[PDB]
Amino acid sequence: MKCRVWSEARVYTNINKQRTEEYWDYENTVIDWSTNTKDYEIENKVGRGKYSEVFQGVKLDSKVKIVIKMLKPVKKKKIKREIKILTDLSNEKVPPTTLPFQKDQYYTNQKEDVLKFIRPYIFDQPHNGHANIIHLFDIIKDPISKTPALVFEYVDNVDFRILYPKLTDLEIRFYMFELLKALDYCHSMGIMHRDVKPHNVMIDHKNKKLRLIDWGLAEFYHVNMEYNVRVASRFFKGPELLVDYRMYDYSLDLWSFGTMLASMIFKREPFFHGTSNTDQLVKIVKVLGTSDFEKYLLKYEITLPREFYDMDQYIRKPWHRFINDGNKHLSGNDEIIDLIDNLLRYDHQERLTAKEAMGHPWFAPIREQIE
Numbered sequence: 392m393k394c395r396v397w398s399e400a401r402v403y404t405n406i407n408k409q410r411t412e413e414y415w416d417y418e419n420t421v422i423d424w425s426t427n428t429k430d431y432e433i434e435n436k437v438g439r440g441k442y443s444e445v446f447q448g449v450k451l452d453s454k455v456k457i458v459i460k461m462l463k464p465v466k467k468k469k470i471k472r473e474i475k476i477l478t479d480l481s482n483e484k485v486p487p488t489t490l491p492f493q494k495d496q497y498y499t500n501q502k503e504d505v506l507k508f509i510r511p512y513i514f515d516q517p518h519n520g521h522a523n524i525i526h527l528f529d530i531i532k533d534p535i536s537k538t539p540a541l542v543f544e545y546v547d548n549v550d551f552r553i554l555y556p557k558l559t560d561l562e563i564r565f566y567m568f569e570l571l572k573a574l575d576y577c578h579s580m581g582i583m584h585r586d587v588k589p590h591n592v593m594i595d596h597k598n599k600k601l602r603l604i605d606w607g608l609a610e611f612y613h614v615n616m617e618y619n620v621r622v623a624s625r626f627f628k629g630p631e632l633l634v635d636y637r638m639y640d641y642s643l644d645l646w647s648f649g650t651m652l653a654s655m656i657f658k659r660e661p662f663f664h665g666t667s668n669t670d671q672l673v674k675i676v677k678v679l680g681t682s683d684f685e686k687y688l689l690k691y692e693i694t695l696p697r698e699f700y701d702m703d704q705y706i707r708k709p710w711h712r713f714i715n716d717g718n719k720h721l722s723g724n725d726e727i728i729d730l731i732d733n734l735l736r737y738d739h740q741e742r743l744t745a746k747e748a749m750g751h752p753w754f755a756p757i758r759e760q761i762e
């Protein structure tokens with residue numbers, strides 16, 4: 392019961408009032424494990440993360456190449472949550488983002504101060520964002536090792552530290568547009584991803600194919616719910632997580648998207664490089680400035696956690712200052728700077744929504760090629 396000023400999502404506010412217990416209540420599901428990995432031939436390791444080791448394999452009946460995510464020990468409800476979210480997203484018969492746009496059903500937060508953040512531009516067309524969500528094929532648990540495991544669609548992915556430096560301006564615009572479609576869809580489904588970052592974005596470059604993976608930290612959005620702030624990874628944590636504003640929403644994903652984008656555009660990786668939890672906030676404020684930070688704390692009447700009282704006064708760094716000859720081919724236009732500026736805001740309510748971001752001028756060359 393931490394928050395003083397209450398906050399609600401600007402968009403898609405009431406999805407989980409519309410949808411009921413059988414959709415969002417992951418704790419009261421029972422996982423239908425497959426008793427055997429007999430349907431699969433498990434090959435070599437293709438990746439890892441904080442919560443898993445991931446192995447390439449083949450589904451023997453169809454010969455489809457898959458991955459198997461072997462889950463490290465965690466609370467069992469986290470496993471139920473990942474499975475529920477993945478199945479909700481894949482099993483929706485008519486993805487809401489494929490339907491005709493309805494503004495009154497979109498901008499659902501009707502507070503006067505929140506409505507001022509509606510942008511003059513918006514992508515208002517149906518889209519295939521649901522097709523950018525990784526597909527879960529099976530749930531398996533070996534009888535001998537007792538290891539819970541998730542079988543997914545395989546993506547032929549290269550580490551971002553190898554791929555991203557090779558990408559052209561137009562290719563970054565393309566892929567980041569694909570990511571926004573995925574986010575618009577999961578948000579429309581009343582779900583926050585909460586771990587948006589390069590390692591969780593599979594790209595098969597030769598097939599121009601993008602998948603948003605790793606749904607293990609995702610959560611259902613409920614109006615005025617206070618969430619744990621110890622989620623995501625240090626470098627991608629929004630200001631709300633650092634100052635312990637627990638009543639956050641889908642906009643957290645857009646901060647993460649923005650920080651990922653800022654890294655690609657300015658070629659500084661990671662963009663906010665904190666040496667500790669404390670210093671992570673310092674790295675952010677060093678950029679956005681102390682002045683707007685304090686206005687933000689005042690707006691929500693946030694009592695700053697104890698650790699941040701040794702913070703110095705910082706003058707805002709204009710984005711222009713991040714431009715240099717190494718990156719100017721990606722950063723040297725007004726459009727990208729304005730996009731980044733409108734994503735990376737202290738106040739979560741101020742940030743572009745996925746749909747607004749998709750309608751931003753920077754994506755014009757991508758939108759042009761849709762029809």
Ligand SMILES: Nc1ncnc2c1ncn2[C@@H]1O[C@H](COP(=O)(O)OP(=O)(O)OP(=O)(O)O)[C@@H](O)[C@H]1O
Binds near residue numbers: 440444
């Ligand atoms: N479908 C896939 N195709 C190819 N590689 C994958 C796939 N799924 C996962 N991987 C690889 O395995 C890694 C770990 O998977 P994932 O991100 O789902 O697990 P995690 O342990 O929850 O990660 P995090 O530490 O970000 O929470 C990924 O970063 C990726 O490199």
Ligand SMILES: [Mg+2]
Binds near residue numbers: 440441591605
């Ligand atoms: Mg991951």
Ligand SMILES: [Mg+2]
Binds near residue numbers: 402578641745746
């Ligand atoms: Mg959104």
